[PDB]
Amino acid sequence: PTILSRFDMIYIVKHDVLKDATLAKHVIEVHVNASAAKETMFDTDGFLTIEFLKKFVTYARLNCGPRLTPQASEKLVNHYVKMRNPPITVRQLEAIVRIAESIAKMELQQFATDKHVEEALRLFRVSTIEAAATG
Amino acid sequence: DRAEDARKQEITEQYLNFLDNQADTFHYRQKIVKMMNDGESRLVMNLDEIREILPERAEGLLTQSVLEMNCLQSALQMAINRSDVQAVVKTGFHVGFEGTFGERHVNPRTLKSSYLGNLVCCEGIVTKCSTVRQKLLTSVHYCPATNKVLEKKFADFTMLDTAVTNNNYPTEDENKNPLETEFGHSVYKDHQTFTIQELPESAPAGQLPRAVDCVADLDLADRVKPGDRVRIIGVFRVLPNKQNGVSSGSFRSIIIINHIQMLSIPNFEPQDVKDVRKISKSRNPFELLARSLAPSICGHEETKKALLCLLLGGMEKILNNGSRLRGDINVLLIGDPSVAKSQLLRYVLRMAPRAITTTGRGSSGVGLTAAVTRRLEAGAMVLADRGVVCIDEFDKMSDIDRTAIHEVMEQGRVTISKAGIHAKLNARCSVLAAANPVYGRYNPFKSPMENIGMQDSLLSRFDLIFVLLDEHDADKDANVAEHVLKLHTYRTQGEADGTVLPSIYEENTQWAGIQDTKILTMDFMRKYIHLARSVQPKLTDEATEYISEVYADIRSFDITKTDQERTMPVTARQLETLIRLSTAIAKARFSKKVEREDTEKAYNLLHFACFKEKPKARQ
DNA sequence: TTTTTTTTT
Numbered sequence A: 001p002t003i004l005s006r007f008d009m010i011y012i013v014k015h016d017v018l019k020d021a022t023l024a025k026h027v028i029e030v031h032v033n034a035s036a037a038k039e040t041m042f043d044t045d046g047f048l049t050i051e052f053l054k055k056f057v058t059y060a061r062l063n064c065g066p067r068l069t070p071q072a073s074e075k076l077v078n079h080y081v082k083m084r085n086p087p088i089t090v091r092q093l094e095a096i097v098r099i100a101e102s103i104a105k106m107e108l109q110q111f112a113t114d115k116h117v118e119e120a121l122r123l124f125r126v127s128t129i130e131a132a133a134t135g
Numbered sequence B: 001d002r003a004e005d006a007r008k009q010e011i012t013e014q015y016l017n018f019l020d021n022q023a024d025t026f027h028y029r030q031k032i033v034k035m036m037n038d039g040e041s042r043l044v045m046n047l048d049e050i051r052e053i054l055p056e057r058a059e060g061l062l063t064q065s066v067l068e069m070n071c072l073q074s075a076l077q078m079a080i081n082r083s084d085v086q087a088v089v090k091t092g093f094h095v096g097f098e099g100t101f102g103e104r105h106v107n108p109r110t111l112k113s114s115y116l117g118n119l120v121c122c123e124g125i126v127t128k129c130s131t132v133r134q135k136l137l138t139s140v141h142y143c144p145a146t147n148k149v150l151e152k153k154f155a156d157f158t159m160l161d162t163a164v165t166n167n168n169y170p171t172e173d174e175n176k177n178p179l180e181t182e183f184g185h186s187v188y189k190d191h192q193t194f195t196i197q198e199l200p201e202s203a204p205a206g207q208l209p210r211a212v213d214c215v216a217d218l219d220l221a222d223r224v225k226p227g228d229r230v231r232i233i234g235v236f237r238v239l240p241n242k243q244n245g246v247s248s249g250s251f252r253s254i255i256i257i258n259h260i261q262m263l264s265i266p267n268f269e270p271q272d273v274k275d276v277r278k279i280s281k282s283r284n285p286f287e288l289l290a291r292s293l294a295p296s297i298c299g300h301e302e303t304k305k306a307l308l309c310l311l312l313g314g315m316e317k318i319l320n321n322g323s324r325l326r327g328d329i330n331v332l333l334i335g336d337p338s339v340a341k342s343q344l345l346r347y348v349l350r351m352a353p354r355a356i357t358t359t360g361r362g363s364s365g366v367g368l369t370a371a372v373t374r375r376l377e378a379g380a381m382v383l384a385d386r387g388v389v390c391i392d393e394f395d396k397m398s399d400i401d402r403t404a405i406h407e408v409m410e411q412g413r414v415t416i417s418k419a420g421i422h423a424k425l426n427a428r429c430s431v432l433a434a435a436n437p438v439y440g441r442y443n444p445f446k447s448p449m450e451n452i453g454m455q456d457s458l459l460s461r462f463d464l465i466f467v468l469l470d471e472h473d474a475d476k477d478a479n480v481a482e483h484v485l486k487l488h489t490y491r492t493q494g495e496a497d498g499t500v501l502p503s504i505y506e507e508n509t510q511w512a513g514i515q516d517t518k519i520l521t522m523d524f525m526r527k528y529i530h531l532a533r534s535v536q537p538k539l540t541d542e543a544t545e546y547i548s549e550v551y552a553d554i555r556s557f558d559i560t561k562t563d564q565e566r567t568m569p570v571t572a573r574q575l576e577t578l579i580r581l582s583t584a585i586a587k588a589r590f591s592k593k594v595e596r597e598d599t600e601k602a603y604n605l606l607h608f609a610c611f612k613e614k615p616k617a618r619q
Numbered sequence C: 001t002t003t004t005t006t007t008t009t
């Protein structure tokens, strides 16, 4: 329980059997197609290629460097005070700020806004409150 | 041959005219006068300054370095002979170089055989060292059979002089009379070798780092130890080898050193001294320094005052019978998680010269003090002598390791008596420590001593103890969150939005949060603390009376009156803490005397540390 | 090689 403070996001992976029947059909069809096989931005299926994605990450890291807007900063103060006076810490606040900057980096933005802050808050709640509910 | 002699005469004359010009524009004659007054025997020159007046000498001094350097040292000897000061030193006078190298700035990886015979400048980390040893240069002998005196000179491949001789030690006269050595007249020199490796920031990934061997003599010996980051100037050269008249063609190469530069602190000018006078003459310099210490951390004002007192320090007293009284100050922080304990430790590690950081998680007491490895091996608190040790996660240390510190924190000594080893070691240093409470989080229903959970003999050795609590309170939560977001939205005034990191007062202060009151620059803080550390104040009668009354009041105060609870033990060491804090406060004023104005501030800080109101969960 | 001792992890 000590080192859980050092991690920004936590998930618990966890009744699949009916949905897992469709997943079993898809996965075993993939493996039989792999057996049959045994016998440049986009892939054929519309997903991004690895050779483009790796280069794009290496480009973005050396060039973007965003900041928050003041209106984006105003929401977090109220959210912090409300959660703390209805385990809330400055570590969690700075983690949320880092996630909002990270989302704004992918769009190659000059600034992060209320949109990126709200998606960061949704991701933080969905990840972290599983540990509060479980164990 | 005679043309070579004429050219050498011309080159020596050119260097002599440069050194002993009638009105010296580069002041090397005055530097020679300084050298002979100080008793030193080598002169440092700027190759960039030789490059302006004699470029045909300067660029030839890189390619044909040996002959040019020999001519330059001969010219230096003639320039010394023109003085009215006498040549005391029996070894000759020498030259070192500095300046711009360009092509010949290299690494151990890029030193290759194209550079042999050239002057070079190289960088790296010292990885080995020989002990200093003495080497014969000339020998003087007396012949008792004839009353004559014989002399002989010696030379070696590692010397810059290319000349070689028989190198047999003389024992008999030409008439086969025996001889007697004159040890008081024979000449020896100090000698050392070492090696340098590539810097880890430059060595390519996966491969092993490459390395180069080095030879140093005379005043250049005994200057380095393993781990030093250095820049070294010398001639790159090759050494032949023989075994029974058969030679392998693979020869060894070295650097023969001329000059060494250390890469791993203060600086002053009279404008800076004027500004130090002005700020010392201002109204409240101690409060100004305490506010200016660490601006990007909100709150913690009393702890910042304590850290400033730690950086200044008290006065050691050594009495007439050899008895010693301690001068250093020791500080402990205990508190809830995410309250910037480790952040303040890292800041003090930046500010203090001679500082070391460790953790209690991965430290043995033997490694923390001294070790037997048979040999004796220094630990962290010995290495930080007359300095600062920062210890993080201090609650995670074992008590077997903690009991090894008790001698160091009071007597300033480490004593060992184990198999074959009996020794004292000096370990005079200041301890700054951070910890979490017993339960991992402060329990308000138990007393502060119960939450701290350490014995009185260890708790008494800390001058100041701070308990830091993370209380939920909407006003403080709003203020702290606003400060943190204001520090995160900041960007420098002369910077574009897309960029990435790969005078006296501060001017932009939105990041600092403090709205209007001024803040000093960190460089000015470093200079001011460096000067104020050397002030040596004395005590006075008003201070003595105030301290003596106040100590008795602190001991006799009873806590059942006020619904407070005691945070520290109170012993006779806390009286000395009052004396130390008074002298440390008086240093910041640049005062020669300790007064009631100092002692009142020291009492207020100590009384803040000693007592704490009960938590709101219990109230 | 194998044996015996004292500090360290």
Ligand SMILES: Nc1ncnc2c1ncn2[C@@H]1O[C@H](COP(=O)(O)OP(=O)(O)NP(=O)(O)O)[C@@H](O)[C@H]1O
Binding pocket: A090, A091, A094, B296, B297, B298, B299, B336, B337, B338, B339, B340, B341, B342, B343, B344, B434, B435, B436, B480, B483, B484
């Ligand atoms: N004014 C502030 N008060 C408290 N924390 C702050 C403040 N400003 C920033 N922080 C952040 O809070 C954290 C400080 O805690 P830190 O020093 O890293 O560990 P700690 O305080 O020693 N707690 P722990 O090591 O778990 O015992 C950092 O992430 C800081 O950036």
Ligand SMILES: [Mg+2]
Binding pocket: B341, B342, B343
């Ligand atoms: Mg910490």
